[PDB]
Design an enzyme around this catalytic site. Sequence first.
Site, PDB file in Angstrom:
ATOM      1  N   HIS A   1     -59.197  34.586 121.562  1.00 32.63           N
ATOM      2  CA  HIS A   1     -59.060  33.339 122.102  1.00 32.63           C
ATOM      3  C   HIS A   1     -60.035  32.370 121.534  1.00 32.63           C
ATOM      4  CE1 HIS A   1     -58.999  29.978 125.117  1.00 32.63           C
ATOM      5  NE2 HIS A   1     -60.077  30.264 125.331  1.00 32.63           N
TER       6      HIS A   1
ATOM      7  N   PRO B   1     -50.512  22.110 111.119  1.00 33.75           N
ATOM      8  CA  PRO B   1     -51.374  21.991 112.150  1.00 33.75           C
ATOM      9  C   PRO B   1     -51.505  22.998 113.207  1.00 33.75           C
ATOM     10  CG  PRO B   1     -50.610  19.962 111.279  1.00 33.75           C
ATOM     11  CD  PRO B   1     -49.515  20.717 110.906  1.00 33.75           C
TER      12      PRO B   1
ATOM     13  N   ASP C   1     -46.363  29.819 106.696  1.00 33.44           N
ATOM     14  CA  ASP C   1     -46.178  28.776 107.878  1.00 33.44           C
ATOM     15  C   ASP C   1     -47.354  28.020 108.201  1.00 33.44           C
ATOM     16  OD1 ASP C   1     -44.339  27.450 109.557  1.00 33.44           O
ATOM     17  OD2 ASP C   1     -44.654  28.850 111.007  1.00 33.44           O
TER      18      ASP C   1
ATOM     19  N   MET D   1     -54.584  38.700 120.792  1.00 32.42           N
ATOM     20  CA  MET D   1     -55.728  38.401 119.683  1.00 32.42           C
ATOM     21  C   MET D   1     -56.887  37.349 120.327  1.00 32.42           C
ATOM     22  SD  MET D   1     -52.432  36.148 117.902  1.00 32.42           S
ATOM     23  CE  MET D   1     -53.258  35.320 116.721  1.00 32.42           C
TER      24      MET D   1
ATOM     25  N   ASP E   1     -36.097  38.935 111.241  1.00 32.20           N
ATOM     26  CA  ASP E   1     -34.786  39.385 111.221  1.00 32.20           C
ATOM     27  C   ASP E   1     -34.146  39.344 112.940  1.00 32.20           C
ATOM     28  OD1 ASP E   1     -34.949  39.850 108.596  1.00 32.20           O
ATOM     29  OD2 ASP E   1     -35.008  41.859 108.724  1.00 32.20           O
TER      30      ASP E   1
ATOM     31  N   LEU F   1     -51.511  28.497 127.062  1.00 31.58           N
ATOM     32  CA  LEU F   1     -52.503  27.796 125.911  1.00 31.58           C
ATOM     33  C   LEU F   1     -51.626  26.923 124.977  1.00 31.58           C
ATOM     34  CD1 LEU F   1     -54.823  30.764 124.570  1.00 31.58           C
ATOM     35  CD2 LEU F   1     -55.249  28.694 126.015  1.00 31.58           C
TER      36      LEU F   1
ATOM     37  N   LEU G   1     -55.000  22.426 115.768  1.00 35.81           N
ATOM     38  CA  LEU G   1     -55.253  21.027 115.370  1.00 35.81           C
ATOM     39  C   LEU G   1     -53.895  20.182 115.739  1.00 35.81           C
ATOM     40  CD1 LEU G   1     -57.104  21.794 111.987  1.00 35.81           C
ATOM     41  CD2 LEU G   1     -58.180  20.839 114.072  1.00 35.81           C
TER      42      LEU G   1
HETATM   43  O1  LIG Z   1     -56.473  30.961 121.268  1.00 29.97           O
HETATM   44  C1  LIG Z   1     -55.459  31.354 120.572  1.00 29.97           C
HETATM   45  N1  LIG Z   1     -55.718  32.554 119.742  1.00 29.97           N
HETATM   46  C2  LIG Z   1     -54.681  33.027 119.173  1.00 29.97           C
HETATM   47  C3  LIG Z   1     -53.488  32.425 118.913  1.00 29.97           C
HETATM   48  C4  LIG Z   1     -53.195  31.160 119.688  1.00 29.97           C
HETATM   49  C5  LIG Z   1     -52.226  30.463 119.273  1.00 29.97           C
HETATM   50  C6  LIG Z   1     -51.759  29.256 119.943  1.00 29.97           C
HETATM   51  O2  LIG Z   1     -50.914  28.519 119.987  1.00 29.97           O
HETATM   52  C7  LIG Z   1     -49.613  28.726 119.119  1.00 29.97           C
HETATM   53  C8  LIG Z   1     -48.551  28.221 119.614  1.00 29.97           C
HETATM   54  C9  LIG Z   1     -48.458  26.808 118.804  1.00 29.97           C
HETATM   55  N2  LIG Z   1     -48.890  27.383 117.504  1.00 29.97           N
HETATM   56  C10 LIG Z   1     -49.781  28.460 117.580  1.00 29.97           C
HETATM   57  C11 LIG Z   1     -52.840  28.723 120.743  1.00 29.97           C
HETATM   58 CL1  LIG Z   1     -52.808  27.150 121.331  1.00 29.97          CL
HETATM   59  C12 LIG Z   1     -54.257  29.444 120.901  1.00 29.97           C
HETATM   60  C13 LIG Z   1     -54.372  30.761 120.289  1.00 29.97           C
END
Ligand SMILES: O=c1[nH]ccc2cc(O[C@H]3CCNC3)c(Cl)cc12
Length: 309
Positions: free
Chosen positions: A106, A154, A151, A104, A178, A35, A112
């Site tokens: 999906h 987007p 944090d 978590m 840490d 992802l 974004l």
């Molecule tokens: O579907 C998701 N559920 C939970 C979490 C999550 C985190 C994701 O990307 C991280 C990596 C780049 N920023 C956030 C992405 Cl791309 C998708 C998900």
Amino acid sequence: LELDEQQRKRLEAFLTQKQKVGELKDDDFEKISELGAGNGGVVFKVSHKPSGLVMARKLIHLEIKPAIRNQIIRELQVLHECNSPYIVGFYGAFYSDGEISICMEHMDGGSLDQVLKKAGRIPEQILGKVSIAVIKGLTYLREKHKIMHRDVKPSNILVNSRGEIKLCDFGVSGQLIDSMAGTRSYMSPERLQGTHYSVQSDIWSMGLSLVEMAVGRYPIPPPDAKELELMFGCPMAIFELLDYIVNEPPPKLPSGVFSLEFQDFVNKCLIKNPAERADKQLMVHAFIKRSDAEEVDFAGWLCSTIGLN
Ligand SMILES: O=c1[nH]ccc2cc(O[C@H]3CCNC3)c(Cl)cc12
């Protein structure tokens, strides 16, 4: 933080599914695809084979003694208490062969930053809905759990085909941070100067994220009169950029392209002084009240733009 009938029901159906899963184990997962990445980790779309639930699994590679990982897992348990339509669902956390796993909900629209790459730039009416979800998510975290995101950017804003917008990756474990030990380009001037920082630093990050999504480019340094003429008709090393954030006037939206209410909204988020910067005040801002009354088909716009399907 009051919920409508549809929100209450979705939250009820997530908890009922979650109660059926039980203890999360390494061998119970099948990788579907990748992802994204990541604040020191990679996120995979996985199948939890016993329950048949599709989840997002974040893997953080960390080589540490059993003592440290047991505390990290206990510190991540706080995530079972966060239940909001603006906070991504949490299934559980575990450790297995040198890596921490965070499981978590999906979000099929991804983040974004990925939606922005596809779309080019995000319309104002869609950014109105994003602003409401971020303000409501930040309000929930502060009011119900006395924690701040720390944090906002987007890539930490997730979207789905049901038109939901949710925050992810807010630090809850001191030991995990840490042991590790991400970009500082979305940090407020007061955070980069090591001074007094509250929830006001997250408001700055939101305002900055909104300008980037509206124009389709990270907004520091500002675009030239010819760059905007190309975009609407109408390099800097990270250390130079952080110095620019602290010492130069804040970025702003170009005029005569966005409404004055959206312009006023981002300017109030991006005031360098954390005391003058808007706080409760954003929830009743003209841009927010107008966006809440607008009937925007976010799911429709999203599915057409990224080709969801
Ligand atoms: O579907 C998701 N559920 C939970 C979490 C999550 C985190 C994701 O990307 C991280 C990596 C780049 N920023 C956030 C992405 Cl791309 C998708 C998900």
